[PDB]
Amino acid sequence: QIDGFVRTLRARPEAGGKVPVFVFHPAGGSTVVYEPLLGRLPADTPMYGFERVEGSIEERAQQYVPKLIEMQGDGPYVLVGWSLGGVLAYACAIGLRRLGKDVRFVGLIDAVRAGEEIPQTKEEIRKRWDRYAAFAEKTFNVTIPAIPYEQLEELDDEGQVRFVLDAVSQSGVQIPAGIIEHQRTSYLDNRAIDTAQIQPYDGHVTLYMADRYHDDAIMFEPRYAVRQPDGGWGEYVSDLEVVPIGGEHIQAIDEPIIAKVGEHMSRALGQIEADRT
């Protein structure tokens, strides 16, 4: 059921059968979140979930792609993810196509890029932590002292959030490790998107688009308040389909909105199975 970073949501038959759907975890979550989607897909569709690994987006895909090939060979590949999971799916599509594999569906469940690019600069690191501190002051009724910008700006995102958490750890009650680890890894996983080197993809991508990001996403990064019509994928994907699903980002993975996603995705899978036969 769990084998390394691969979760079996529905096992494929011993031989033959329908093409598996490979799903990729969202930041701060596991691939159990795809069970409602699975319920809306055709009967006997296999599904395997890829859980968290370390590195840049590209380095994560360098770990996932060999495992995909061990499981599915030349293809066909169906790759799906919500949020960070969609960026991971896309990176895997890129890696598989480089190896000449047959990728037939890439489904991004509201994996919508920030509407304005996030600068990778010292000034932006200063502005970012200034904003976070302001929100902390209000939320926790404290004043925040001078921020050590020089220390933060030479660290990558993981180093930054680790630095801040370690400063918090110096005083007060000890915070349970599970909470610290969840917050650290969620933060870094979401930030990994910002430094991704997105490559052009020559196949069809389906972007299931919600109406907006939820408030917590925009508190994390204000540039998520703006969405472009192509969700930031049009420059990389000539064969791009957008499927509006309404609601907020955080709702896209759940009933009832996931029924819209599943109805559309079922038709796409149906066509892939028909073409095989």
Tab-separated table of C-alpha atoms in Angstrom:
chain	number	residue	atom	x	y	z
A	1	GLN	CA	0.000	0.000	0.000
A	2	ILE	CA	2.810	2.404	0.860
A	3	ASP	CA	6.074	1.619	-0.904
A	4	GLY	CA	8.695	4.332	-0.352
A	5	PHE	CA	7.176	7.493	-1.745
A	6	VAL	CA	4.542	5.619	-3.775
A	7	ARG	CA	1.024	5.175	-2.369
A	8	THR	CA	-1.288	2.680	-4.056
A	9	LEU	CA	-4.796	4.227	-4.148
A	10	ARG	CA	-6.116	1.569	-6.541
A	11	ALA	CA	-3.846	-1.229	-7.749
A	12	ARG	CA	-3.641	-2.057	-11.455
A	13	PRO	CA	-4.586	-5.592	-12.487
A	14	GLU	CA	-1.880	-8.269	-12.733
A	15	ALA	CA	-1.878	-7.845	-16.510
A	16	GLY	CA	-3.480	-5.461	-18.972
A	17	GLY	CA	-6.140	-3.108	-17.679
A	18	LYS	CA	-6.649	0.623	-17.938
A	19	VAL	CA	-3.881	3.203	-17.948
A	20	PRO	CA	-2.987	4.242	-14.365
A	21	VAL	CA	-3.436	7.814	-13.174
A	22	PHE	CA	-0.346	9.045	-11.348
A	23	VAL	CA	-1.144	11.765	-8.828
A	24	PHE	CA	1.277	14.025	-6.996
A	25	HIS	CA	1.036	15.341	-3.434
A	26	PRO	CA	0.120	18.978	-2.588
A	27	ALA	CA	2.203	21.054	-0.155
A	28	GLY	CA	1.462	19.955	3.388
A	29	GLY	CA	-0.624	17.006	2.300
A	30	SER	CA	-0.444	13.425	1.066
A	31	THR	CA	-2.039	11.802	-1.949
A	32	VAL	CA	-4.995	10.615	0.184
A	33	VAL	CA	-6.497	13.942	-0.969
A	34	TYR	CA	-7.095	12.379	-4.407
A	35	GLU	CA	-9.594	9.756	-3.139
A	36	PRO	CA	-12.648	11.912	-4.001
A	37	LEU	CA	-11.260	12.357	-7.562
A	38	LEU	CA	-10.713	8.603	-7.763
A	39	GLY	CA	-14.398	8.079	-6.955
A	40	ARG	CA	-15.269	10.246	-9.940
A	41	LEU	CA	-13.040	8.396	-12.398
A	42	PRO	CA	-14.028	5.322	-14.350
A	43	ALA	CA	-14.357	2.008	-12.561
A	44	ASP	CA	-11.088	0.031	-12.390
A	45	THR	CA	-8.891	3.029	-13.196
A	46	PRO	CA	-5.623	2.395	-11.307
A	47	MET	CA	-4.178	5.231	-9.263
A	48	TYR	CA	-0.775	5.668	-7.673
A	49	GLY	CA	0.237	8.663	-5.581
A	50	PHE	CA	3.709	10.164	-5.361
A	51	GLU	CA	4.579	11.602	-1.970
A	52	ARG	CA	7.107	14.169	-0.812
A	53	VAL	CA	10.776	14.073	-1.735
A	54	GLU	CA	13.513	16.698	-1.318
A	55	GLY	CA	15.060	19.166	-3.726
A	56	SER	CA	14.204	21.701	-6.385
A	57	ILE	CA	11.181	20.875	-8.532
A	58	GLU	CA	13.616	19.539	-11.138
A	59	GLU	CA	15.463	17.401	-8.592
A	60	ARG	CA	12.162	15.967	-7.317
A	61	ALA	CA	11.210	14.976	-10.834
A	62	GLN	CA	14.640	13.398	-11.250
A	63	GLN	CA	13.601	11.066	-8.396
A	64	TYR	CA	10.028	10.492	-9.617
A	65	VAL	CA	10.657	9.858	-13.334
A	66	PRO	CA	12.768	6.677	-12.917
A	67	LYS	CA	10.071	5.303	-10.625
A	68	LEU	CA	7.362	6.205	-13.135
A	69	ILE	CA	9.291	4.317	-15.835
A	70	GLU	CA	9.775	1.307	-13.571
A	71	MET	CA	6.019	1.206	-13.072
A	72	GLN	CA	4.685	2.101	-16.559
A	73	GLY	CA	7.470	1.608	-19.120
A	74	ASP	CA	7.047	3.403	-22.442
A	75	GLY	CA	3.624	4.686	-21.439
A	76	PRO	CA	1.025	5.847	-21.787
A	77	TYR	CA	1.476	8.327	-18.981
A	78	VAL	CA	-1.352	10.158	-17.268
A	79	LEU	CA	-0.044	12.674	-14.719
A	80	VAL	CA	-2.259	14.700	-12.419
A	81	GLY	CA	-1.831	17.046	-9.493
A	82	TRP	CA	-3.508	19.733	-7.389
A	83	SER	CA	-1.518	22.765	-6.262
A	84	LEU	CA	2.212	21.880	-5.906
A	85	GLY	CA	1.182	18.448	-7.177
A	86	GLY	CA	0.350	19.951	-10.571
A	87	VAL	CA	3.792	21.551	-10.870
A	88	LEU	CA	5.351	18.195	-9.925
A	89	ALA	CA	3.220	16.380	-12.545
A	90	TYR	CA	4.274	18.858	-15.212
A	91	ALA	CA	7.966	18.505	-14.318
A	92	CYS	CA	7.598	14.748	-14.662
A	93	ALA	CA	5.911	15.140	-18.054
A	94	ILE	CA	8.926	17.144	-19.161
A	95	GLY	CA	11.368	14.518	-17.932
A	96	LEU	CA	9.441	11.650	-19.485
A	97	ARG	CA	9.189	13.362	-22.871
A	98	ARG	CA	12.925	13.939	-22.842
A	99	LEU	CA	13.328	10.187	-22.515
A	100	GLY	CA	10.939	9.708	-25.435
A	101	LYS	CA	8.048	8.349	-23.381
A	102	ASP	CA	4.409	8.617	-24.351
A	103	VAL	CA	2.661	11.228	-22.179
A	104	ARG	CA	-1.034	11.446	-23.052
A	105	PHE	CA	-2.563	13.589	-20.296
A	106	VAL	CA	-1.267	16.213	-17.872
A	107	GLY	CA	-3.947	17.469	-15.508
A	108	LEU	CA	-3.260	20.530	-13.362
A	109	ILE	CA	-5.944	20.946	-10.726
A	110	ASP	CA	-5.834	24.691	-10.178
A	111	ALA	CA	-2.026	24.756	-10.226
A	112	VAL	CA	-2.157	28.407	-11.258
A	113	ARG	CA	0.994	30.502	-11.311
A	114	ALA	CA	1.251	33.755	-9.431
A	115	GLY	CA	-0.071	36.461	-11.740
A	116	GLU	CA	3.149	38.437	-11.464
A	117	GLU	CA	6.554	36.703	-11.214
A	118	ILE	CA	8.129	36.517	-7.732
A	119	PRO	CA	11.505	38.304	-7.823
A	120	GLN	CA	14.490	36.352	-6.502
A	121	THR	CA	16.155	39.303	-4.863
A	122	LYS	CA	17.438	40.684	-1.592
A	123	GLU	CA	14.857	43.459	-1.726
A	124	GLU	CA	12.043	40.915	-2.128
A	125	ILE	CA	13.346	38.832	0.794
A	126	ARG	CA	13.265	42.004	2.921
A	127	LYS	CA	9.740	42.902	1.788
A	128	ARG	CA	8.504	39.355	2.291
A	129	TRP	CA	9.723	39.031	5.880
A	130	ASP	CA	8.568	42.618	6.621
A	131	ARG	CA	5.089	41.533	5.548
A	132	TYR	CA	5.196	38.345	7.551
A	133	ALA	CA	6.349	40.254	10.615
A	134	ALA	CA	3.557	42.791	10.250
A	135	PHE	CA	1.014	39.969	10.130
A	136	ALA	CA	2.649	38.323	13.157
A	137	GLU	CA	2.441	41.607	15.134
A	138	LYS	CA	-1.287	41.849	14.518
A	139	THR	CA	-2.085	38.163	15.004
A	140	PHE	CA	-0.068	37.698	18.186
A	141	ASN	CA	-0.265	41.198	19.653
A	142	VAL	CA	3.528	41.720	19.715
A	143	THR	CA	6.097	44.146	18.334
A	144	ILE	CA	8.697	42.507	16.105
A	145	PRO	CA	12.254	43.735	16.568
A	146	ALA	CA	14.651	44.724	13.760
A	147	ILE	CA	14.803	41.906	11.238
A	148	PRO	CA	18.303	40.532	10.495
A	149	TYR	CA	18.024	41.020	6.750
A	150	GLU	CA	21.691	40.277	6.067
A	151	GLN	CA	21.403	36.842	7.642
A	152	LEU	CA	18.114	35.918	5.912
A	153	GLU	CA	19.015	37.076	2.422
A	154	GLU	CA	21.990	34.731	1.980
A	155	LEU	CA	19.857	31.669	2.827
A	156	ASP	CA	17.542	29.751	0.494
A	157	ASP	CA	13.878	29.442	1.444
A	158	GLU	CA	14.475	26.386	3.607
A	159	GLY	CA	17.329	28.115	5.401
A	160	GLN	CA	15.195	31.222	5.936
A	161	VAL	CA	12.227	29.455	7.502
A	162	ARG	CA	14.593	27.238	9.558
A	163	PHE	CA	16.384	30.369	10.844
A	164	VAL	CA	13.117	31.973	11.954
A	165	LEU	CA	11.758	28.781	13.548
A	166	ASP	CA	15.031	28.335	15.420
A	167	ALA	CA	14.777	31.878	16.779
A	168	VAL	CA	11.225	31.130	17.964
A	169	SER	CA	12.502	27.916	19.623
A	170	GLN	CA	14.885	29.870	21.892
A	171	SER	CA	12.084	30.913	24.255
A	172	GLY	CA	8.757	29.781	25.639
A	173	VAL	CA	7.170	26.364	25.606
A	174	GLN	CA	8.603	23.676	23.315
A	175	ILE	CA	6.511	23.286	20.165
A	176	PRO	CA	5.688	19.684	19.213
A	177	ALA	CA	7.988	18.459	16.448
A	178	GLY	CA	5.113	17.470	14.196
A	179	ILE	CA	3.859	21.040	14.087
A	180	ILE	CA	7.310	22.517	13.379
A	181	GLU	CA	8.021	19.970	10.649
A	182	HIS	CA	4.641	20.452	8.969
A	183	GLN	CA	5.049	24.204	8.903
A	184	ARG	CA	8.672	24.063	7.677
A	185	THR	CA	8.088	21.582	4.891
A	186	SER	CA	4.855	23.148	3.741
A	187	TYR	CA	6.500	26.525	3.504
A	188	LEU	CA	9.475	25.279	1.578
A	189	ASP	CA	7.429	23.110	-0.767
A	190	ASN	CA	5.228	26.011	-1.741
A	191	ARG	CA	8.288	28.236	-2.245
A	192	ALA	CA	9.926	25.625	-4.518
A	193	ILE	CA	7.476	26.607	-7.215
A	194	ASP	CA	8.992	30.115	-7.355
A	195	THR	CA	12.437	28.939	-8.463
A	196	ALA	CA	11.249	26.283	-10.883
A	197	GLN	CA	12.790	26.465	-14.346
A	198	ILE	CA	9.670	25.637	-16.399
A	199	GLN	CA	10.359	23.961	-19.750
A	200	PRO	CA	8.092	23.975	-22.799
A	201	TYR	CA	5.924	20.871	-23.086
A	202	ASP	CA	4.856	19.597	-26.519
A	203	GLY	CA	1.750	17.729	-25.425
A	204	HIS	CA	-1.760	18.517	-24.216
A	205	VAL	CA	-2.204	20.031	-20.756
A	206	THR	CA	-5.520	20.428	-19.006
A	207	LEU	CA	-5.711	23.188	-16.413
A	208	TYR	CA	-8.744	22.964	-14.151
A	209	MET	CA	-9.184	26.525	-13.063
A	210	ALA	CA	-10.862	27.817	-9.953
A	211	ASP	CA	-12.016	31.402	-9.607
A	212	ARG	CA	-9.355	32.510	-7.129
A	213	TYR	CA	-6.780	31.622	-4.564
A	214	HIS	CA	-7.993	31.388	-0.997
A	215	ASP	CA	-6.938	33.984	1.602
A	216	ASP	CA	-4.153	31.883	3.144
A	217	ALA	CA	-2.425	31.570	-0.276
A	218	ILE	CA	-2.463	35.330	-0.738
A	219	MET	CA	-1.156	35.874	2.828
A	220	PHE	CA	1.680	33.456	1.908
A	221	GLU	CA	2.410	35.320	-1.325
A	222	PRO	CA	0.446	38.386	-2.394
A	223	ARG	CA	1.080	37.855	-6.086
A	224	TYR	CA	-1.376	34.957	-5.971
A	225	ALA	CA	-4.219	37.542	-5.803
A	226	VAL	CA	-3.811	38.002	-9.556
A	227	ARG	CA	-4.497	35.266	-12.145
A	228	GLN	CA	-3.771	35.408	-15.831
A	229	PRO	CA	-6.178	33.890	-18.345
A	230	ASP	CA	-3.733	31.055	-19.185
A	231	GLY	CA	-2.845	30.575	-15.509
A	232	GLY	CA	0.785	31.300	-16.408
A	233	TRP	CA	1.152	28.180	-18.555
A	234	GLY	CA	0.459	29.542	-22.054
A	235	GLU	CA	4.058	30.576	-22.789
A	236	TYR	CA	5.182	26.987	-22.105
A	237	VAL	CA	2.269	24.985	-23.462
A	238	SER	CA	0.915	25.616	-26.947
A	239	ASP	CA	-1.689	22.847	-26.556
A	240	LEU	CA	-3.379	24.202	-23.419
A	241	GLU	CA	-6.953	23.551	-22.355
A	242	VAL	CA	-8.492	25.456	-19.450
A	243	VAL	CA	-11.511	23.942	-17.704
A	244	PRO	CA	-13.212	26.422	-15.368
A	245	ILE	CA	-14.429	24.816	-12.121
A	246	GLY	CA	-15.261	27.845	-9.962
A	247	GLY	CA	-14.686	28.204	-6.224
A	248	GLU	CA	-11.430	28.752	-4.372
A	249	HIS	CA	-8.146	26.877	-4.750
A	250	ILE	CA	-8.580	25.034	-1.480
A	251	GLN	CA	-12.013	23.698	-2.616
A	252	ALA	CA	-10.877	22.380	-5.988
A	253	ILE	CA	-9.813	18.975	-4.641
A	254	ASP	CA	-13.047	18.256	-2.793
A	255	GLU	CA	-16.673	17.447	-3.499
A	256	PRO	CA	-18.636	18.984	-5.064
A	257	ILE	CA	-16.137	20.774	-7.328
A	258	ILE	CA	-14.017	17.655	-7.886
A	259	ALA	CA	-17.064	16.133	-9.659
A	260	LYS	CA	-16.541	18.655	-12.446
A	261	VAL	CA	-12.883	17.707	-12.647
A	262	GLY	CA	-13.719	13.986	-12.641
A	263	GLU	CA	-16.430	14.226	-15.309
A	264	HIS	CA	-14.037	15.940	-17.699
A	265	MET	CA	-11.063	13.743	-16.795
A	266	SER	CA	-13.199	10.606	-17.245
A	267	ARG	CA	-13.977	11.649	-20.835
A	268	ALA	CA	-10.280	12.197	-21.504
A	269	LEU	CA	-9.374	8.794	-20.070
A	270	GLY	CA	-12.158	7.234	-22.069
A	271	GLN	CA	-10.632	8.572	-25.243
A	272	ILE	CA	-7.187	7.286	-24.321
A	273	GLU	CA	-8.589	3.786	-23.677
A	274	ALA	CA	-10.557	3.839	-26.930
A	275	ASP	CA	-7.478	4.860	-28.919
A	276	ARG	CA	-5.500	2.019	-27.371
A	277	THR	CA	-8.061	-0.602	-28.369
